[PDB]
């Protein structure tokens, strides 16, 4: 049963929501791989009328690249609880989000016969705190 039910880290997105950049450089070193532009939608008063327009970057880290990052990120954070997803996720911080899920997630991310993950097989906020807290730190 377990082993295929036990949480794991799938991607950690580090993005800097600026409003118009030079910031990519730090993201590349803080993570270890090229950042991606962040175009915006809708015309708005914050002199942000441009539809297609660089206004921040992000970086999606997977596997070791994600751990080796969290092995310093997490420490720089305190928070927990309430600040957690209903799906077992949490964002802290410059933003650093951590997407958590169980083994058979590809079923919902593949092209052929894809399917949505059953609520039961989903990851709860609780089952999430446990996994992470059980990896170099404390909850609340």
Partner 1 sequence: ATGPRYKVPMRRRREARTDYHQRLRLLKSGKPRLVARKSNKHVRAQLVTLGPNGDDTLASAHSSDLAEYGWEAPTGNMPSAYLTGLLAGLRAQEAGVEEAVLDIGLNSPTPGSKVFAIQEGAIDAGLDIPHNDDVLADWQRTRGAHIAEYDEQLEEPLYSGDFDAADLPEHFDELRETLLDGDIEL
Interface ranges with partner 1 (CB under 8 A)? 111-115
27-32 contact pairs (CB < 8 A, 24+): 27/57, 27/58, 27/59, 28/59, 30/69, 31/59, 31/61, 31/65, 31/69, 32/61, 32/65, 32/68, 32/69
**DSSP class per residue in 7-21:** -EEEEEEEEE-----
Closer to partner 1 at the Cβ: 94 or 107? 107
Closer to partner 1 at the Cβ: 75 or 103? 103
The entry of partner 1, RNA, none near residue 134 (CB within 5 to 8 angstroms by kind) is none
What's the min distance (Å) between Cβ of 109 and RNA? 4
- Interface contacts to RNA, rule CB under 7 A: 1, 3-5, 10-11, 33-39, 51-52, 58-63, 65, 102-107, 109-115, 117-121
Closer to partner 1 at the Cβ: 42 or 115? 115
The entry of partner 1, RNA, none near residue 15 (CB within 5 to 8 angstroms by kind) is none
Nearest C-alpha neighbor of 86 from the set 132, 133, 123: 123
Q: How many CB atoms are closer than 10 A to CB 129?
A: 18
What's the min distance (Å) between Cβ of 2 and partner 1? 23
Backbone phi, then psi, for 39, in 5-degree steps? -70, 165
What's the min distance (Å) between Cβ of 116 and RNA? 7
What's the min distance (Å) between Cβ of 6 and partner 1? 22
Closer to partner 1 at the Cβ: 93 or 103? 103
11 in Cβ contact with 62 (< 8 Å): yes
């Amino acid at each position: 049963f377990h082993e295929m039910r036990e949480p794991r880290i799938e991607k950690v997105v580090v993005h800097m929501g600026i409003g118009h950049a030079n910031a990519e450089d730090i993201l590349g070193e803080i993570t270890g791989q090229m950042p991606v532009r962040t175009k915006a939608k809708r015309t708005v008063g914050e002199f942000d009328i441009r539809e297609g327009d660089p206004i921040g970057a992000k970086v999606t880290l997977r596997d070791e690249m994600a751990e080796e990052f969290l092995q310093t990120a997490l420490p720089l954070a305190e928070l927990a609880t309430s600040q957690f997803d209903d799906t077992g996720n949490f964002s802290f911080g410059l933003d650093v989000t951590v997407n958590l899920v169980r083994p058979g997630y590809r079923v919902a991310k593949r092209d052929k016969a894809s399917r949505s993950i059953p609520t039961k097989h989903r990851l709860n906020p609780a089952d999430a705190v446990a996994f992470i807290e059980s990896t170099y730190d404390v909850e609340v």
